[PDB]
Design a protein around this ligand. Structure first.
Ligand SMILES: *[C@@H]1O[C@H](CO)[C@@H](O[C@@H]2O[C@H](CO)[C@@H](O)[C@H](O)[C@H]2NC(C)=O)[C@H](O)[C@H]1NC(C)=O
Ligand SMILES: COCCCCCCCCCN1C[C@H](O)[C@@H](O)[C@H](O)[C@H]1CO
Ligand SMILES: [Ca+2]
Ligand SMILES: [Ca+2]
Lengths: 856, 88
């Protein structure tokens, strides 16, 4: 990376001004005579003792253990930005009652308790408690700073230059900032996107973490530089409790983290807008996930194919190359659901077009892929070539839908191109309509989309993005809206794919840039990584930081984007990627071809094995995504989420869990012959899924590995569903029989769910056409029951096999199901591993049934 | 009185099963020899008879996968993809 192209805090005048304020007595005080209390909010005026500027605090108790704090100017020269379209609803409130009051303090009870809020007038402070336990303090270090809007027109407070770019800054200094104290918290996470550790570092002696969507060429590791996306949500975990802080601000934001009896302090500093913060009081991490999901929504349910394997590069040359790649997967018995078309497929990077030499017959190419039951993804970026012959440009120019400069002319980034104003709802409607099959000529139902460079990336712009003083819908400046620009591109594209099908088909859109709420629109990836071992390692903490803040559909380019990976690294990357939510191999223009059959046989075989593992686990992945969509729980999880009292798991980032059932420790070092696997849980057992060897927790196991090894353990007490008949794509498999893998707990019990639907439409929601089954094992009986009786589905899917780990040899196996006579199943048992295989149950997955193991 | 027919033995000698477990859509033989007509075995093969032309073998996982693998279309017999004969 070239660090000189990106501002450090000292080079961002508002960060330098805010950060220069050091801990001390706050000049802000609440004027308690102005206090007003209603059923939905408490309001009170605050005053800066020196400047005499008046602010208004709107304090609200909310349902589901949350508190909202909003601070704005009492009499502003002009309205300040308030983030739209991120919140899914107006949050239901909880009544605040005065339970104590003196000349300097007011104690408020939330509903009928146990939560309480103490407002201190001088210096202004808020304390949040549950009964007598102090959870969080606000402005404890006196770092609140609210720069009021001065008469429009010291160093860099007004006009400001960065390199050769001048920001005219018409409104001058308007930054806002506030600090929070977390007693008992030593571990904090979130605020992606940074190529850094899962457990966030203290920023005291260096740079704060930066949240400003930026295109960072050849980004480096273990540093706080802002990357492509920004989710201003921070989670705090201890043995005793979980808390979350959601700072709803779309402007450039810097986050300072400091430690201190153990306590972590967090400071947020934003360029513009209001102070709008949600405190999510848990108490469990799952309660924090539900709290945050109630505010910004849940992960969109991916169509099943998008959970398969994706093959990409910059670029497949032409139709013949795409068809050869497609045929290559089949000739080498490697499954693949999607083939991707990067920027060279279009007519000279005019999006929604096709190069007439490379792709003369796109509908025919799509029909060929459809005959193989595969899909294609085409790239569509939010920069429009300034060309009078280009219909998209002509329409956007004619309708005035581009981002403008202050003089009212359409902004042009030279290399020229204009930028549609995705903050304008009419522009988003126009964009969505461009995805109709009539408008996007050459597109078909098996064509999906990739939104790249949507930070927006502007080659000749400051920090490779848009000028701060560009003008958007409603007269807002680019500085006010920056971090939601990408999200709007993602949202409008997803809406386009839904609309083109008449509202029936679920979308699939991959986006580079993102914000809070982006989980509602599709997948994201960690951008332009590098073909190196440390970038393979960092894919875990980066996608975990994303999972914690609601973005479950995350991945990193398999093999690395830049440079040529050695074959061993490519194998380990396929193994890692096979156990991550978004699974795509991708590569830069100047790299050698790396389709997996180009390697020597040993490497091809290890890659095929990884692909087979992923495809067989599709029913499990689909069920975890359904649970993310319904509950807001992450798909990929840090171990501390499942073991909140195990302090040894709090910083782990070389392993992760999928739901509560699988623990994964991918090999991530060249020449490794073993891995140290931490298997947590005081009364827990773990089964090595390859050998069926049982291991008791808590322990660190040194597991031997070969090139084809993927260290995966199933937790005792779980039931994992698989499609053991691996075919060429997920569409081929989606009506096939299921094998249930039952891992018995030490108490001889297990449970697990399975979600099934048609794999691609909204029929599960509009017609309740789906199944949600619960499988439960206890005593010597395995039972299938409905986990949601509203869901009905006509399906040929049946149970072909049951594999029970930790079981003794029965004398007889009996299956009962309504409408059939009692059945006797044959079985096989390995006494060394205590693995029992039940042959061909033969029952519909839609039916209730029971299998009883008789000791007879 | 009545003599019973003998059971099926896997071509690899790993098991002996009644002929009702042959093409019963469950894999009983380690070599896949009990399921030549279905997608049940991970190492099985399906024979494209391609009457009049060169016969071909395909992977068992390509039986009723909804994709036309045999030129005679016999690999797709219960999938909802109706394959045309393209052997010529
Ligand atoms: C809201 O907060 C309350 C209080 O912390 C939660 O209730 C507690 O849940 C824990 C388990 O996490 C129990 O040990 C306590 O006994 C419960 N306390 C009380 C007073 O009920 C509650 O679950 C939270 N609710 C939501 C929706 O997040
Ligand atoms: C200082 O930088 C000098 C070099 C910069 C030159 C322009 C590079 C444009 C690349 C755009 N785009 C970025 C995506 O993250 C990739 O996944 C994708 O393959 C690629 C092509 O569409
Ligand atoms: Ca059989
Ligand atoms: Ca077929």
């Amino acid at each position: 990376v070239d660090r000189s192209n990106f501002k450090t805090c000292d080079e961002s005048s508002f960060c330098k001004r805010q950060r220069s304020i050091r801990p001390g007595l706050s000049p802000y005080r609440a004027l308690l005579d102005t206090l007003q209390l209603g059923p939905d909010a408490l309001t009170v005026h605050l005053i800066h003792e020196v400047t005499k500027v008046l602010l208004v605090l709107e304090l609200q108790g909310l349902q589901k253990n949350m508190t909202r704090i909003r601070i704005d100017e009492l009499e502003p020269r002009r309205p300040r930005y308030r983030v739209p379209d991120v919140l899914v609803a107006d949050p239901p409130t909880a009544r605040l009652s005065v339970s104590g009051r003196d000349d300097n303090s007011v104690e408020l009870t939330v509903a009928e308790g146990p939560y309480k809020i103490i407002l201190t007038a001088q210096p202004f402070r808020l304390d949040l408690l549950e009964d007598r336990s102090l959870l969080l303090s606000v402005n404890a270090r006196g770092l609140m700073a609210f720069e009021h809007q001065r008469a429009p027109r010291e160093p860099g407070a007004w006009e400001e230059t960065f390199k050769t770019h001048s920001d005219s800054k018409p409104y001058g200094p308007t930054s806002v900032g506030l600090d929070f104290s977390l007693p008992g918290m030593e571990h904090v996470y979130g605020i992606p996107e940074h190529a850094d550790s899962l457990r966030l570092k203290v920023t005291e002696g260096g740079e704060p973490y930066r949240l400003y969507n930026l295109d960072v060429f050849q980004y480096e590791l273990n540093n706080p530089m802002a990357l492509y996306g920004s989710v201003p949500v921070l989670l705090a975990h201890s043995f005793h409790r979980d808390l979350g802080i959601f700072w709803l601000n779309a402007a450039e934001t810097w986050v300072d983290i400091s430690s201190n009896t153990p306590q972590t302090d967090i400071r947020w500093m934003s360029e513009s807008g209001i102070i709008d913060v949600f405190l999510m009081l848990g108490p469990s991490v799952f309660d924090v996930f539900r709290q945050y999901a109630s505010l910004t929504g849940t992960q969109a349910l991916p169509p099943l194919f998008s959970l398969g394997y994706h093959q990409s590069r910059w670029n497949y040359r032409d139709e013949a190359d795409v068809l050869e790649v497609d045929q290559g997967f089949d000739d080498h018995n490697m499954p693949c659901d999607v083939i991707w078309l990067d920027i060279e497929h279009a007519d000279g990077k005019r999006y929604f077009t096709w190069d007439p030499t490379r792709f003369p017959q796109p509908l025919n190419m799509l029909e060929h892929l459809a005959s193989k039951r595969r899909k294609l993804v085409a790239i569509v970026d939010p920069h429009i070539k300034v060309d009078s012959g280009y219909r998209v440009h002509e329409e956007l120019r004619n309708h005035g839908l581009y981002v403008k400069t202050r003089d009212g002319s359409d902004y042009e980034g030279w290399c020229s191109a204009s930028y549609p104003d995705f903050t304008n709802p009419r522009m988003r409607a126009w964009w969505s309509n461009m995805f109709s099959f009539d408008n996007y000529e050459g597109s078909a139902p098996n064509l999906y989309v990739w939104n790249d460079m949507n930070e927006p990336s502007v080659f000749n712009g400051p920090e490779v993005t848009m000028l701060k003083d560009a003008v958007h819908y409603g007269g807002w400046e680019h500085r006010d809206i920056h971090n939601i620009y990408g999200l709007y591109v993602h949202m409008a594209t997803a809406d386009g794919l839904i609309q083109r099908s008449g509202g029936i088909e679920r979308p699939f859109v991959l986006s580079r840039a993102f914000f809070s709420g982006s989980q509602r629109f599709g997948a994201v990836w960690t951008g332009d990584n590098t073909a190196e071992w440390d970038h393979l390692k960092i894919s875990i903490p980066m996608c975990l930081s994303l999972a914690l803040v609601g973005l479950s559909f995350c991945g990193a380019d398999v093999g690395g984007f830049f440079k040529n990976p050695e074959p061993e690294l490519l194998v380990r990357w396929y193994q890692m990627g096979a156990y991550q939510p978004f699974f795509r191999a991708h590569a830069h223009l100047d790299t050698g071809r790396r389709e997996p059959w180009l390697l020597a046989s040993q490497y091809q075989d290890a890659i095929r094995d990884a692909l087979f593992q992923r495809y067989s686990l599709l029913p499990f992945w689909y069920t975890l995504f359904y649970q993310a969509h319904k509950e807001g729980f992450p798909v990929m999880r840090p171990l501390w989420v499942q073991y909140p009292e195990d302090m040894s798991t709090f910083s782990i980032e070389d392993q992760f869990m999928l739901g509560d059932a699988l623990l994964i420790h991918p090999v991530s070092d060249a020449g490794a012959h073993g891995v140290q696997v931490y298997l947590p849980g005081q009364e827990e057992v773990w089964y090595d899924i390859q050998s069926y060897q049982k291991h008791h927790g808590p322990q660190t196991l040194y597991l031997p590995v070969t090139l084809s090894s993927i260290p995966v353990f199933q937790r005792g007490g779980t039931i994992v569903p698989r499609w053991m008949r691996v075919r060429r794509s997920s569409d081929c498999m989606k009506d096939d029989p299921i094998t249930l893998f039952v891992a018995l707990s030490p108490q001889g019990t297990a449970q697990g769910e399975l979600f099934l639907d048609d794999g691609h439409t909204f029929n599960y929601q509009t017609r309740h056409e789906f199944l949600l089954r619960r499988f439960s094992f206890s005593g010597s009986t395995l039972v299938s029951s409905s986990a949601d009786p509203k869901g009905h589905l006509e399906t040929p899917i049946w149970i072909e096999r049951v594999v029970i780990m930790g079981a003794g040899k029965p004398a007889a196996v009996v299956l009962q199901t309504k409408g059939s006579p009692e059945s006797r199943l044959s079985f096989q048992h390995d006494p060394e591993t205590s693995v029992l295989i039940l042959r061909k149950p033969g029952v519909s997955v839609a039916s209730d049934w029971s299998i009883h193991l008789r000791a007879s | 009185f009545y003599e019973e027919s003998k059971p099926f033995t896997c071509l690899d000698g790993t098991a002996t099963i009644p002929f009702d477990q042959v093409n019963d859509d469950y894999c009983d033989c380690k070599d896949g020899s009990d399921e030549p007509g279905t997608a049940a075995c991970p190492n099985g093969s399906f024979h494209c008879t391609n009457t009049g032309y060169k016969p071909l073998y395909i992977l068992s996982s390509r039986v009723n996968d909804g994709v036309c693998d045999c030129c005679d279309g016999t690999d797709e017999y219960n999938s909802g993809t109706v394959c045309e004969n393209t052997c010529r």
